[PDB]
Design a protein around this ligand. Structure first.
Ligand code: HEM
Ligand code: HEM
Ligand SMILES: N=C(NCCC[C@H](N)C(=O)N[C@H]1CN[C@H](C(N)=O)C1)N[N+](=O)[O-]
Ligand SMILES: N=C(NCCC[C@H](N)C(=O)N[C@H]1CN[C@H](C(N)=O)C1)N[N+](=O)[O-]
Ligand SMILES: C[C@H](O)[C@H](O)[C@H]1CNc2nc(N)[nH]c(=O)c2N1
Ligand SMILES: C[C@H](O)[C@H](O)[C@H]1CNc2nc(N)[nH]c(=O)c2N1
Ligand SMILES: [Zn+2]
Lengths: 407, 411
C-alpha cells in the first residue's frame, strides 16, 4: 500500500502514497515488466468528470462546498443533456498544469506551476489555428528568453470533427530520401516531409528546411502554412575551441514544441494541444545529432578531431560525443537562447521530486526517460529509485492523423 | 500470448514466448512499474514440483524428455525427497543449473559467454578452512595470469537454514574502507561496514587506500573465520593514461577479477547460499561507478583540476570530459598489462547479438534495461535503443540478506 523509494547515493528514503490515486494501467504485470517499451459514453464520462472536479475543488480548499456540489450537479446535467460538457477556464488551466505535473517522462516538471495557458477553444479554421500557433511561438520564444506555454484547441466531439496538428512538433526540419539511398535532412521526418509535398509544399531540399504547418480543423482536410521565418529562432552551432566545428554547418531551433499529443482533462479529450518549454542540451547534442537514425554526425566530428577510430576501446565516439554537446550548450548560451544542461536539469528534478513527495505524497517518474542519454550515473537521477504510474489529467500518445483521416 | 519488442534504431522487431514459462514475480503490477527499484527452508510440499520443472527442463535440453532415464530420475528424486526431505543434484544437473542461472540473469550484459562457464563442485566442503582452499583455487584458475576465464564455485546447499555456508564478503576481492574520526573516509567507502566487522574479528588493517580485504568464511552455520588471500594470487592493475603522464600520479589501481560472492543460486528448489562466481570487468564498472560515484572513490574533481578544465559551471561539461578520460585510462591500463576487460561499446554490441540469437533459438531473453544500459554514453550504445522485457526464470541468482544481520553467533 505504502511504497518507498530510496536514493542509493544519499540513502534518503521517501514514502509514496500518491500512487494509490492511480487510475490508468502501466503495461506491466506481476510476471513481466515493460518499463523500457516506448508505447505500452455518458456513463464513462461523469465518473471521470467527478474525479476531476473533486481533485480541483480539493486543491482550492473548497472540497465538499456548495460551489463544489453546484458545479458537480451542473456538469452532471450538462453531460446527461449534451452527452459532454465544457470546462470553466479555471479548470482548463488547472487541468493543463496538472497533465504536465503528471508527465512521468518529463525531467523539467519543477516548472509545472508556471505554465502559460492559451485557450483556443473558440477556434474554427486552419487559418485560425495558424494564427493561434504563430502567437504561441512568438510568446514562448520571447526573443530567446523562453517561457513555457500550451495552446488548447477545441475538444473532441464525435471523433469525426477533431482538431489536429499533423506536425510532430511545431518546428522541425524536413527529410528527403535521395537517389543515393541516403537521406537528406532529418530522417525522423522523411515521411511527413512527403505528406507535405503530397499536399503541395515546395520543399527547398536543404539539410535544415523548417517544415510547414499542416493544420486540421473540425475534421476537415489539413492545410499548409509557412511559419513566419522571423518567428523561428535558430542557433548556429559552433565550438568554443574548435573553429573547424562551424564548418559542419549545423544549426538547431531554439523552441522544442510537441504538437501531436492528446490532453485529457475530466474525461474530455483535446487532440490538438501543442506545448513548449526549452531544451535540455543532450536532446540536441546526443539524440538529434548522434542517434544513428538521425543526423548521425559522430564519425564526421571524430574525423575532424583526428581521433583514433580504429578501436572502440579508444572511446573516440565518447570523446566526440562530449564535444558535440559542449558546442550546443555553448552556441545556445552565446546567442542568449534558453537551454539547460543535463547536470542542472537533473539536479532540479531531484529537488522537485522531494517537494512533490512531501506536498503531494509522491511523483510518478519514468527512470528510463528521466536519466539523460549521456553520463547517466554522474547525474543524480541515476541513483534515485522512482515509481512510475499514470495519473490524470495527462498527456497521451495518439495515432498519426494521416493513418486515420478519411479525406 | 506473444509479446513484441522493437529496436528504435534499426526497426527490428522480436517476438517473445519465453515469458510464458515465467513463474516468479517482478514487483510490478498493472498499476505501477517498479522497474527502477534495486531490491523490489522449503517444504516437501513445494519442493518436488520445483524439482520436477527443473528436471523436465534439463531432460528437454539433452533431447531425452520422456525417456526412461528421465522418468527414473524423477522417481528417484521424489523418493529421495519424501525420504530425506531434500535431494542431491547429479554433477551434470549442477553444471546445467549454474549455466542457466547465469543465462537467466536479466541484469547481466555479459551473457553471450554463458555456456562457457567453468563449474567447480565444492559440495563435499565441510569447513571454513576448506572453503578458503576452494576459493584460492577459484581465484587462481579464473585469473589465469590475466587471460580471465568465467568460473563459479558451489558450496553445500541449504538444509535446515541453521547450517548455511556463506561468504561474508560481497566480492572475493575488494578494497577496505575506513571511517576516520574527522568524518572522512579512507579507501573504498562502499566497504566500511564490512571492514569494521573484519577488524572486530581480529583482522589487522594496514589502513591504506587500496588494502585487499580478508575473506570471512562461514561453513555449516558456524561462526565465520578470517583468511588472507595469498597476495601473489591477486592480480592488480596500476591505472595510467595514454597521453596524460600525470594520470599515474593519482595513485590509482584496481583488482582484475570481479567476483560476486553474496548471492544465492537456486536450482530445482535447492538453495546454494555460497556460490561465488566471476567473469571479467566491463570498463565503466571501474571508470564510471567505482572511481566516479560520489559515494565511492569520487575522483572527478581531482582529475578535472589536473586537466585544468573550467569547473566554474557544470554547463562546460567538465565532469563529462574528465569521466571519458578516466575511462580511457582504465581500458588502456588493462589492455597494456594484458588483463581481460571489455569496453561498453563492445559489450553492449555483443549483448544485442546474444539477445537476438536467444529470441530466435530460445523464444526470448529476459533483460533489465535499467541495468543493461551503461552508466555513461547510454544512447551511443545499441542497448539504449532496444526495448526489453524483464521477467524471472529459474534456475536463478537472487539477493540474500547480509549474514551479519541474521547470524546466530555461537562464540
Ligand atoms: C520548461 C522546460 C522543460 C524542460 C527543460 C523539459 C524537458 C523534457 C525532457 C528532456 C524530456 C524528454 C524529451 C525526449 O527525450 O523526447 C521531456 C519530455 C516530456 N515533457 Fe517536458 N520539459 C519542459 C517543458 C514541458 C512542458 C511545458 C510540458 C507540457 C506542458 C512538458 C511535457 C512533457 C511530456 C508529456 C514529455 C514526454 C513526451 C513523450 O513521451 O515524447 N514538458 N521534457
Ligand atoms: C564474462 C564476463 C562478464 C561480464 C563482462 C559481465 C558483466 C556484468 C556487468 C557489467 C554487470 C553489472 C554489474 C554492476 O553494475 O554492478 C553484470 C551483472 C550481473 N552478472 Fe554478469 N558479467 C560477466 C560474467 C558473469 C557470470 C560468470 C555470471 C554468473 C555465473 C554473471 C552474473 C551476473 C549477475 C547475477 C548480475 C547482476 C548482479 C547484481 O544484481 O548485483 N555475470 N554482469
Ligand atoms: N524539451 C522538450 N522536449 C520534448 C520535445 C523534443 C524531443 N527532443 C523530441 O524530439 N521528441 C520526439 C521524438 N521522441 C518522442 C517520442 N515519443 O517518439 C517525440 N519539450 N519541452 O516542451 O520543453
Ligand atoms: N563484471 C561483473 N560485475 C559484477 C561485479 C562488479 C560490480 N561492479 C559490483 O561492484 N557489484 C556490487 C555493487 N552493486 C551490486 C549491488 N546489487 O549492490 C553488487 N562480474 N562478473 O562476474 O564478470
Ligand atoms: C528502447 C528505449 O525505451 C528507448 O530507446 C527510450 C529510452 N529512454 C529515453 N529517454 C528519453 N528521455 N527519450 C527517449 O526518446 C528515450 N528512448
Ligand atoms: C536506483 C537505480 O535503480 C540504481 O541506481 C541502478 C540503476 N542502474 C544500474 N545499472 C547497473 N549496471 N548497476 C547499478 O548498480 C545500477 N544502479
Ligand atoms: Zn514494470
Amino acid at each position: 500500500r505504502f511504497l518507498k523509494v530510496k536514493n542509493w547515493e544519499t540513502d534518503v528514503v521517501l514514502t509514496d502514497t500518491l500512487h494509490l490515486k492511480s487510475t490508468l494501467e502501466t503495461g506491466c504485470t506481476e510476471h513481466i515488466c515493460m518499463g523500457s517499451i516506448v508505447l505500452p459514453t455518458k456513463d464513462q464520462l461523469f465518473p471521470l468528470a467527478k474525479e476531476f472536479l473533486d481533485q480541483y475543488y480539493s486543491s482550492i480548499k473548497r472540497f465538499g462546498s456548495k460551489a463544489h456540489m453546484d458545479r458537480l450537479e451542473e456538469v452532471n446535467k450538462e453531460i446527461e443533456s449534451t452527452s459532454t460538457y465544457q470546462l470553466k477556464d479555471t479548470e482548463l488551466i488547472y487541468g493543463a498544469k496538472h497533465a504536465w505535473r503528471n508527465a512521468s517522462r518529463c525531467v523539467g516538471r519543477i516548472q509545472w506551476s508556471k505554465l502559460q495557458v492559451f485557450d483556443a477553444r473558440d477556434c474554427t479554421t486552419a487559418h485560425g489555428m495558424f494564427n493561434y500557433i504563430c502567437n504561441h511561438v512568438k510568446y514562448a520564444t520571447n526573443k530567446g528568453n523562453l517561457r513555457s506555454a500550451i495552446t488548447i484547441f477545441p475538444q473532441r466531439t464525435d471523433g469525426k470533427h477533431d482538431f489536429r496538428v499533423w506536425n510532430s512538433q511545431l518546428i522541425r526540419y524536413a527529410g528527403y530520401k535521395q537517389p543515393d539511398g541516403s537521406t537528406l535532412g532529418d530522417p525522423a521526418n522523411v515521411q511527413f516531409t512527403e505528406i507535405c509535398i503530397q499536399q503541395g509544399w515546395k520543399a527547398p531540399r536543404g539539410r535544415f528546411d523548417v517544415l510547414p504547418l499542416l493544420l486540421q480543423a473540425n475534421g476537415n482536410d489539413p492545410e499548409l502554412f509557412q511559419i513566419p521565418p522571423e518567428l523561428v529562432l535558430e542557433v548556429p552551432i559552433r565550438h568554443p575551441k574548435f573553429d573547424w566545428f562551424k564548418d559542419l554547418g549545423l544549426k538547431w531551433y531554439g523552441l522544442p514544441a510537441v504538437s501531436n499529443m492528446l490532453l485529457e482533462i475530466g474525461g474530455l479529450e483535446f487532440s490538438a494541444c501543442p506545448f513548449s518549454g526549452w531544451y535540455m542540451g543532450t536532446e540536441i547534442g546526443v539524440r538529434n545529432y548522434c542517434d544513428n537514425s538521425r543526423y548521425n554526425i559522430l564519425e564526421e566530428v571524430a574525423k575532424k578531431m583526428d581521433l583514433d577510430m580504429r578501436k572502440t576501446s579508444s572511446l573516440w565516439k565518447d570523446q566526440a560525443l562530449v564535444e558535440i554537446n559542449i558546442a550546443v550548450l555553448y552556441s545556445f548560451q552565446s546567442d542568449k537562447v534558453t537551454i539547460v544542461d543535463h547536470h542542472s536539469a537533473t539536479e532540479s528534478f531531484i529537488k522537485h521530486m522531494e517537494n512533490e513527495y512531501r506536498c503531494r505524497g509522491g511523483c510518478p517518474a519514468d527512470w528510463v526517460w528521466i536519466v539523460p542519454p549521456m553520463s547517466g550515473s554522474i547525474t543524480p537521477v541515476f541513483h534515485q529509485e522512482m515509481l512510475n504510474y499514470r495519473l490524470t489529467p495527462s498527456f497521451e500518445y495518439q495515432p498519426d492523423p494521416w493513418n486515420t483521416h478519411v479525406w
